[PDB]
Subunit: 309 residues, 4 copies
C-alpha cells in the first residue's frame, strides 16, 4: 500500500520539490531520474538523510524502469533558450524523449508537469503519453492562486484559509484574476470592503494582481532563479492526489467544452483526487473575465499549433 513519486529532473525545481516532500512526509518512496547519472546519485545521497531525523521517505536515484509501479511522475526537466519560441521547441523535444521512456516502463499513474511553459508542456504530455486527460495535470496557476490569496490575506488581516479567489488562464502573461468570484469569508470582496476596508480602492486590488502576475520576475531579478515557491505548489498538488482529497485547485487541465473552450490545457479551478482531475469546474465569469480567458486560450493555441497537429 506504499506510494511512489518519480521526479524527472534534479535541478533546482526537482530537488526543492524532493526536499519539500521529504520534510512534509507525503509519499513513501521517491525516485530521482536525470541525464547525468553520477550527479543524480549525488543528488539522491544529499536528499536521503530524512530517516534518522524522523522523516521516513525512502529516496534513491533510479531509472525509467522504476516508473512501472509509480503513482505519480513529476516532470521538472527542461532546456537551459534565448527567445520564448526557441525554449518551447527545445522543451517539447525534451518532453517527447522523457514521456516515451516513462510509457515504455509500463507506467500507468498520473503525470504532474512543472516545466514552463506549463500549459503547453502539459498538453504535450497528454499527446505524447496517450493517457486520459484526468491523469495528465500541469501545475498551472496553483502558485499564482496561492500568491493571490496570500496577498489578500495580508490586505484584510485575516487567515488565508478565509480568502477565496482564483487566478485562471495561462500560467504567464495572460493570466487573469477572477474578481467577480473573489470572496472574503462567504461575502463578495466588494461587500467585505464596504464594511471592513472602506478606504480600500480598485487601485489596491489591481496592484495586488500585478504583484501576483510579476512575482517570478521580481524573484528572478534579485536572485537569478526561483524554485522554492513552485516546490510548495507541486507538494500541495501531490498531497491532493495521494490523499484523495477531492479538493479544488487551479491546475492546468484539458478543455473539452468547458467555458466554450476546446483542445487546450489551461488553468481553471478543478477537483483533484486519486483519480487525477475529476472535473474542470465551470464558475460563472463576467463578460470581461470570459473575454480575458478566451484571449489566454487563443494565446496558448498560437504557441501550440506550430508544435502539435
Amino acid at each position: 500500500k506504499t506510494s511512489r513519486v518519480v521526479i524527472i529532473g534534479t535541478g533546482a525545481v526537482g530537488s526543492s520539490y524532493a526536499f519539500s516532500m521529504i520534510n512534509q512526509n507525503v509519499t513513501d518512496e521517491m525516485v530521482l531520474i536525470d541525464l547525468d547519472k553520477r550527479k543524480t546519485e549525488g543528488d539522491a545521497m544529499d536528499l536521503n538523510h530524512g530517516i534518522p531525523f524522523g522523516a521516513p521517505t525512502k529516496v534513491w536515484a533510479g531509472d525509467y524502469g522504476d516508473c512501472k509501479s509509480a503513482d505519480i511522475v513529476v516532470i521538472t526537466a527542461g532546456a537551459a533558450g534565448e527567445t520564448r519560441l526557441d525554449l518551447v521547441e527545445k522543451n517539447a523535444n525534451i518532453f517527447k524523449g522523457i514521456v516515451d521512456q516513462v510509457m515504455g516502463s509500463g507506467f500507468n499513474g498520473i503525470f504532474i508537469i512543472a516545466t514552463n511553459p506549463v500549459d503547453v508542456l502539459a498538453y504535450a504530455t497528454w499527446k505524447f503519453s496517450g493517457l486520459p486527460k484526468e491523469r495528465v495535470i500541469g501545475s498551472g496557476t496553483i502558485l499564482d492562486t496561492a500568491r493571490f490569496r496570500f496577498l489578500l490575506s495580508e490586505y484584510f488581516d485575516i487567515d488565508v484559509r478565509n480568502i477565496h479567489g482564483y487566478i485562471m488562464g495561462e500560467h504567464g502573461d495572460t493570466e487573469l484574476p477572477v474578481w467577480s468570484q473573489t470572496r472574503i469569508g462567504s461575502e463578495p470582496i466588494s461587500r467585505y470592503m464596504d464594511k471592513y476596508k472602506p478606504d480600500g480602492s480598485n487601485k489596491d486590488l489591481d496592484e495586488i494582481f500585478v504583484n501576483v502576475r510579476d512575482a517570478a520576475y521580481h524573484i528572478i531579478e534579485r536572485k537569478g532563479a526561483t524554485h522554492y515557491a513552485i516546490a510548495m505548489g507541486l507538494a500541495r498538488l501531490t498531497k491532493a492526489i495521494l490523499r484523495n482529497e477531492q479538493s479544488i485547485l487551479t491546475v492546468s487541465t484539458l478543455m473539452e467544452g468547458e467555458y466554450d473552450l476546446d483542445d487546450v490545457y489551461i488553468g481553471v479551478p478543478a477537483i483533484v483526487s486519486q483519480k487525477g482531475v475529476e472535473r474542470a469546474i465551470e464558475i460563472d465569469l463576467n463578460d470581461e473575465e470570459m473575454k480575458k480567458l478566451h484571449h489566454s486560450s487563443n494565446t496558448l493555441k498560437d504557441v501550440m499549433k506550430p508544435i502539435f497537429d
Copy 2:
C-alpha cells in the same frame, strides 16, 4: 519560557474528551484539570498523563484555582444539566450560580487569559462569564455553533463528494433549537450552492438541504437517543477553537460572542461568524442576510433574552 497552558474546569465526559483530543493533537504545553471531586480528578489526570512516553509531550496534572494564574485559556465544561423537575430558566439560574463561583475563583488567582465556555446553555453562560469576570468581550468566548457549522459543512461535503475545505456554510444563532442555516451565504467553492447544484447536482432537491439542516439541528438528540451521552463531537470543536487562539490564526469560526450592534442585536451572546486569534474574538463579522434569515436570527436572540431576563 513561552509555554502555553490550558486549564479545564470540569472533568466529566466533555472535559476529559477535550483533554484527550488536545493531548493527541499536541496543541498546548501544559494542561491542568480542576473539578469538584479531588480524588476522582487525580485519577482522571493519572489516566490522561500517558502521552509523554508515546511521543505526545503535553504535561497533564490535577490542580487547583491557583494554577489559573499563568493560564492562557480556561475552558469551563462544569455545570448541571436540566432535569425533568425544572425549567430552562431554573437550569440557567442554577448554572449561573455555579459559574459565579467558578469565575470568582479563576479571577481570584490572578488569571488574565481567555475563557472558553462549553457548558450548556452556552450562549447564556458565556454572557454570564463576561458579566462575572469583568473582562473585555474579546476574551470571553462561547463555543456557540462551532460544532453545528462543522456538521453542516461535513454533511454538505458528503452530499457534493468534495473536500470539506471547499464547503462554505454557517450555522448562526443560539446553540440549540433556534439556530439557523444561512443558505443565502452557502457556497460550494466560490459559487452559491444553488448555482453549483444547477451545474453538478441534477438529482438534488431543496428537500435534501432541509434534511441536512434538520440532521445538524437534531444531531445531539440523535446521538443521545442511541448511546445515552455525547462528548467526542464537542471535544473536537473545543480543540479547534483552542488551536485558533493559541496559534493566533485570525480565522473565521462561528462562536458565541457579545452583540453590540451587529445584526441590530444588543446585550446578548449569540453564535456568529467571528475572527478568532490570540486576542480572542477580534471581530463579530456581519454577513448580509436575507429577510427570513434576519427574522430567524432575531427570533433566536429573543429566545435567549427570555431566559436571561429574570436573572441578568
Copy 3:
C-alpha cells in the same frame, strides 16, 4: 491503498482507542462492532466528527463482514467477573464467539488483543483463529514499559526517548523490570547514577517499579476505570504495524523456544512491522531476571491449562 482498522467493543477502552486514532490520524477507515447495534451506531456518530476539523479518518458502525478487507482487528470487548478465574472463563467464551465471526468474514489481517488478561486472551485468539503467531499480538507490557521509561525520564530529568528499559512477563502481578538491561542514553543505569545521580538508591528504583506495577490499581481506586492509558498504547502498536516500522515494542507474543519458554504468550521486546511480530527478541537476562520470567510464564500457564488443550 487505504488502511482499515476494526474495533470490537465500544466501551471505554475501544472508544478511547478510536478517539486517540482519529486525533493522531493513523488509519484511513475505522469500523466499530459491538453487541448493542443501536448503541454502537451512536458511538460511531459521536466519534465521526473529525473530518470537518481536519482529521480525515472515516468512522462507521459495521458488522463482521466489514472485517474481510481489514488490515487489523482490535479486540477490546469483554465481560462486565468477581474472581479472576471467573472473569478469564467468561472472556475466553466471549473471544471464541468474536474470533469465529471475524474468521468467518474472510479476514486475513492482524489481531491486536487489548482485553485483560491480555496474554491469556492473545493465546486464545491465536488458538481460535488458526492464524500464524506473527499476526496475533497482545498489547502485553507496552503500557508498563511506557510507564517505566516515563518515570525514569522524570527521575533523571532527561527526554523519555533517551531512557531504555523494558518490563517483561505477564501484563499483571508477575511482571518484572529488566534492570540489567536498563540504559540511560547508552550507559547502564548504575554507571549513569554513579556520575549524575550519586544520591540515588536501589530503594528509589524499586519504588519506580512498584509505581509501574500498581499504576492501574491506583487509577482505578480513584476514578473507577482506566482507558486513556491503554488507548495510547494500542495506538502506538497500531502505528508500528501500519507504518511498517520494524520497531522494538514489548508486546505479548508466542514463545517457541525463546528464553527456553514454549507454548505461552508473554510480554517480551519484539520487532513489530506490517508483518506483525517479525521476531521475539532474546535479550541477555541475569539469573534472577530469568527466574522471574519463568515464574511469570508458569503463572500464565496455570491460568491457561484449565481453558486450553
Copy 4:
C-alpha cells in the same frame, strides 16, 4: 505573544536549505534572513515566503542585525570555504575574522538567545563564537557531529533492518577527519552490538562495521564528488538541533560544546553526547570509553587545538 524567532546568517545553499526544511517542518514562528548581498537575500526571502497559502504558517523575511534583538536562536552558516592557495589555519583565521564581525553585530542588537554554528570548521568556529560573544558555554552550540551520528545510526538501521529509533551509536570528536565511532557504546535495542550480531546477524563481519564508519566519515566528500556541493543533509541536522532547543526536549544529541574537564579535555569545543534543551547545552555527557576510543578522542582534540593555537 510567546512567538519564537530564528535568525539565519548566510543564505547560501546551507542557510537556504535550512530555512526551507524549517518552513516545511513548522518549527518556528518567525524566520529572518541576513546576508551580505541585500538584494539577493531579498529574493531568497521572497522565494522562501510561499509557505503560508500552502498551510505552512512560518513568517519569513529578509532583515538586518536589529532583528536579532528578539531572536531565540541565531544560526550562523556564513563564511569562506578553504581554497587551494591557503592552509587550514589560513581558513580558520579568515573565518574567525568573519565571525568576530558577525558576532559583534548580533550582540550589538541586544540579542540574548542561543547561537547555533554551522560554518566549517564548526568546532573551531563555535569556540570562536563563545569567546567573541561573552555568552555562557550553554548558549553557544556547534552542530558538531549531529549529522555524522545520524548517518551512523541510519546505516546501522539498514544493516540490521530495524527502526533507526532502536539504533544507539555516537560519532564523537572533531566534525571532520579525526572523528571516531564509539563502538564500545553502540547498542541495538538494549544490547551491545557484538551481542546483537552474535544472535541476529550471522553473515556479519567487523569489516562491515569499519565500512559503515568509513561511509560516515567520507559521506560529504562522496556527495561533493558527485554533485559538486552538499547542503540538504546538514540542513536536516540543523533543523533537528533547533527543534530540541525550541521544544525544550532535554534530549541527547552529539553537538559541539565546550570541554571544561569532561573526558580530561579543556579549552576546546568538540562533539560529544550532550543534553540539549531551551537552556542550550545543559550538560556534556561523559560516557565510558575504551582505551583506544579515549586515545582517538584526545588525538581529535589535539588536532583542533593545533589549528586554534596560533589565533586564540
